[PDB]
Structure formats: structure tokens, C-alpha cells
Amino acid sequence: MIFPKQYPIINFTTAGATVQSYTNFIRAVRGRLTTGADVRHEIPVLPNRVGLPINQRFILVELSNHAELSVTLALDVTNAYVVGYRAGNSAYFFHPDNQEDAEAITHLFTDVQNRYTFAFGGNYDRLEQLAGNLRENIELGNGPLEEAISALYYYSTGGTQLPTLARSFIICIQMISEAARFQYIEGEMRTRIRYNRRSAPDPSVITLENSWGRLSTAIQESNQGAFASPIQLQRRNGSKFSVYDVSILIPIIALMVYRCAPPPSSQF
């Protein structure tokens, strides 16, 4: 047999990548993460986890290498989170947050011979501890990505040490999930690809990543766009930047996590 559907796959390679091919990739990931059901202040909202059928729950990102290697990451559509990956005959999942997530990930990579669930979760704090480095000290760009794809591919066979695996996840998550979430972070990665120059993320990138949930909730709870409480971000040079309203974020955030139902008066 072969029980219906199967999750959408988007392909990207680091080999010969360009600003245009990376832009096409991120646009496609955003297109599979959202449905068009839910747009607030011109900003798409991800599907609500509540009642979402398991057949619509994930997307697959197949990454390949100039080294001719390929790994497939699985992203949860509710939050763009990388929940695990497959490399040939092994799959690995981060420790699930709850029982319902544990069941859901049994629907991924269902014919791999070897399935493992890490005993650690996949949040940045945990991965930074394992990597022995913070995000601010881990270079991003097309070279880091090419190297991360090889690292994930060789984990099975003892080639990749834990610290290097956790660093490689840190690279993938920011270059795929965070770029999908934020046009600003997609733009940061386009710069590094255009000049083929790797560099660690500056405070503007890091404070956006750390603030995604808070900004999603502040936008969704706003009064016609106005925040009850401002949110402080940082500029590139580390100086503070106060956000009072959704308006200044329209060019910056591309997707929000679903927090609250939209109040009457906005998709009519």
C-alpha cells in the first residue's frame, strides 16, 4: 500500500547558491508553512496547533551539499521549528515538549531503519550549551551551511562530535527557520551569500530571534496595531530600539506563531 498524501518537500543546495536561489527557497518554505487563512496587519500567522490534522502538521526541507551529500529536516508548521532530521537510514528527533508532539513525530520518516530521540530538546539555550558556543560566536553563511549539512550527514557513523552536531543545528535553524520567520534575517543571510563571507549574527539578529514569540503576541494583542507595552530590540551596533507598533515590523517579520484568536473586525 501507501496511506494517502505525504508532507511537502522543498529543496535547497548550498552548491553554487546565490541570493536568488536562497530567496526562492525561503519564499517556498513560507508558502508551505502558511495557508493564507490568517493575516494580521499584513503579516501572515502560522496555523493554529489546536485541531490541526496530522497530515498538515509538517514540511520537509531537503538540503544538499557541494560534497554531494543530503539531509532532510522536518519543520513543524505551527512554529517553523526544526523537530528532527533524516540522513540516509537514520533519523534523529529533539526531545519532545509534550505527549501530543511525541505522537506527532511518529508520523515523520516512517520507513527509516534507525530512529532515535535525543534526550535533549532543540531550543537554542540547550544547543549552545552542547556546542560550547553562543549564537553570537557561530558564523553563518553559505560555507557554514555546506559544512553543517556534511556534519549532520556523518553523525550516524561517529564522524561528527556532539558539539559539532549542536553547532550545525544552530546554523540550520537560523538560516532556514529564522529566515522564514523574519525578512530581516533572510536579508542578513542574502548579504553573506552574495559576498560569500561568513559572519556571526549581530545583536539585531539575535534580539529578533529571542523576541519572536513576544512580538507575535504583542502584535496579536495590540489595539489596532498599538502595543500596550513596548518591546525593546537592539540595532546592529547593540544600541536599544523601542517597538511601539506593528507598523515598523511589517518590513521585518514575515510570519507569527498563532497566539490568540483575531478580534472581530479584520479579515472581512
Ligand SMILES: Nc1nc2nc(C(=O)NCCNC(=O)Nc3ccccc3)cnc2c(=O)[nH]1
Ligand atoms: N530546533 C529548533 N530550535 C529552535 N530554538 C529556538 C529558540 O530557542 N528560541 C529562543 C526563544 N525565542 C522565541 O521567541 N521562541 C519561540 C516562541 C514560540 C514558538 C517557538 C519559539 C527558536 N527556533 C528554533 C527552531 O526553529 N528549531
